[PDB]
Amino acid sequence: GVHPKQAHTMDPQLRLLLEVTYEAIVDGGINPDSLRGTHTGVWVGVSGSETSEALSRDPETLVGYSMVGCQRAMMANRLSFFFDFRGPSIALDTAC
Amino acid sequence: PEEVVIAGMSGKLPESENLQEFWDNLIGGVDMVTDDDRRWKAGLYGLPRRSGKLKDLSRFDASFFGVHPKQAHTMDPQLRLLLEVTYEAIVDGGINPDSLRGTHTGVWVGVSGSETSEALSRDPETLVGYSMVGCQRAMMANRLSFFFDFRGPSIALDTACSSSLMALQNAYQAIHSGQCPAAIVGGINVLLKPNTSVQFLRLGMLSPEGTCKAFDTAGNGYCRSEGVVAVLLTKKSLARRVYATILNAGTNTDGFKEQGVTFPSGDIQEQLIRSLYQSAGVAPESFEYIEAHGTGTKVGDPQELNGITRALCATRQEPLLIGSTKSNMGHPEPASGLAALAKVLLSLEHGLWAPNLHFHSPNPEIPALLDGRLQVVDQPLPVRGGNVGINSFGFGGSNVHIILRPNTQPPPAPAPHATLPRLLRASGRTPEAVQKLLEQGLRHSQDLAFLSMLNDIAAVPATAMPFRGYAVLGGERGGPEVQQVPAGERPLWFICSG
Amino acid sequence: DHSLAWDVPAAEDFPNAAIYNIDTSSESPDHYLVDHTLDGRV
């Protein structure tokens, strides 16, 4: 449910991570709809925001979508929003 | 479990070089947002002119922290200011920092921007390697752990606008379960990349006037601000000075929202609030002041206050005081929570509730404000006494909420030893620091706890802090004495006269 | 001891000679340029 224009401005990391997360959930034999509304948490360890730099480099043309799709904090909040997880959503940053 | 208290606090905030000046601005009605040209030309790209900016960023005492000049020039200002503020905060609680060296103390830092690292990596050829060590996102906490020698966890978590309060909650969880005896929580945010402000403006969050008219009918959007705040948390058996006691601190995410990811949710926040002071065992009627998020948006404000009204106003008789520090000093994205906590703690210390600025007409969408149930602090109000609550809802969806029991320790009854003259010793980087410490001590000669706390921290090796001084308090022939301390150990010899 | 002043990034240190990409795609904001056609070639 990501609008096509927002898809282009989304960080590739998040675009791949959504698919990877969905595959992982089913990999355990758990239908995702079962977890909807629970207190499942989402911890994501990321130490890079290169996409944000590229998209936010032109003030006259940069659009507001990029912030929602590229912000480092959004890496976990996007997953929580899509899968409807009411648990904590954090984005650790310790390197390596 | 074990009691968790907020031992110390300190930091820099817009138009305020320290916490005392911050409080002076808060209670004096001075607006901290400014229309200056420090960070960038006013009105660039159509951005709002007003913004909360620190007084100075190019100051750092590298030699004390053992950072060589070449490496210092490439350090993120956030990191330098955080080092200084953390050291200031640790002593604020009366704890000598050396006492924690080698302990299992943990560090959590809420940082949401790394513009400096991006700037320093511009030219592939010119850039130097040690630039990353001082600018990397994770290095914000690891540098603190390295310098102060903390063996506990060292994390830097973004969690959007609730980074600071999220870190505080994580530290509370760590201490509560016995994992760590003490923790350092910090929130840092600086404005250096105008493109970020342009992004926010295009998203529509920023208000053209640049004023966070919290709870008011004219709410448009918040104004970006800067701040650096650090707080020291310890188990009660270790704290010397206790600002308050953390009864509970929880977290939860809004989950799926039909309106959109950025659209705030009220029901989730109400559920979080109810679960917190239910599991904490506290009754709603104990609350005396709730520091609402108060961003100033047209949708966020009605959502959260309505949620607070359902959560805490269901059965209480007298009105519940409400406030939002973001109307005074703008909105620092990651450091928002810690700034509100600092305002709350300062108000509790001084016994007065700092007023709220730019509030003239209540928002019609909020029934409580029109009614008497919910009351905004539009002017100084004496502290009657009760539990307090702080919440911070990041625009991503993360929600954080904590409950504090303010410390109420009446001054001790007079004792004969109070009349006895006392000794005060101080150590500083420069003679001005030592003289300042001695003057403040003299002004408060009758505060035994203050004198003891000052004495405890002054014990620092001469190499680090080369200026030492002392002053006898309560003695008529008492004049402050200061002089440089020669380095190197010196033997001590007794002579027993005849 | 704040005698010294250290470096701090300036406004111009971040991006913003100029290069413009003209895209006639339907989604591109410059889609209207497809109307200005002379001799059957835009």
UniProtKB/Swiss-Prot annotation, chain C:
Transmembrane segments: none annotated. It is found in: Cytoplasm; Melanosome. Ubiquitous. Prominent expression in brain, lung, liver and mammary gland. The active site is at 36 (proton acceptor). In adipocytes, S-nitrosylation of Fatty acid synthase occurs under physiological conditions and gradually increases during adipogenesis. Homodimer which is arranged in a head to tail fashion. Interacts with CEACAM1; this interaction is insulin and phosphorylation-dependent; reduces fatty-acid synthase activity. The relatively low beta-ketoacyl synthase activity may be attributable to the low 4'-phosphopantetheine content of the protein. Fatty acid synthetase is a multifunctional enzyme that catalyzes the de novo biosynthesis of long-chain saturated fatty acids starting from acetyl-CoA and malonyl-CoA in the presence of NADPH. This multifunctional protein contains 7 catalytic activities and a site for the binding of the prosthetic group 4'-phosphopantetheine of the acyl carrier protein ([ACP]) domain. (Microbial infection) Fatty acid synthetase activity is required for SARS coronavirus-2/SARS-CoV-2 replication. This is Fatty acid synthase. The chain holds residues 837 to 884 of 2511 of the full protein.
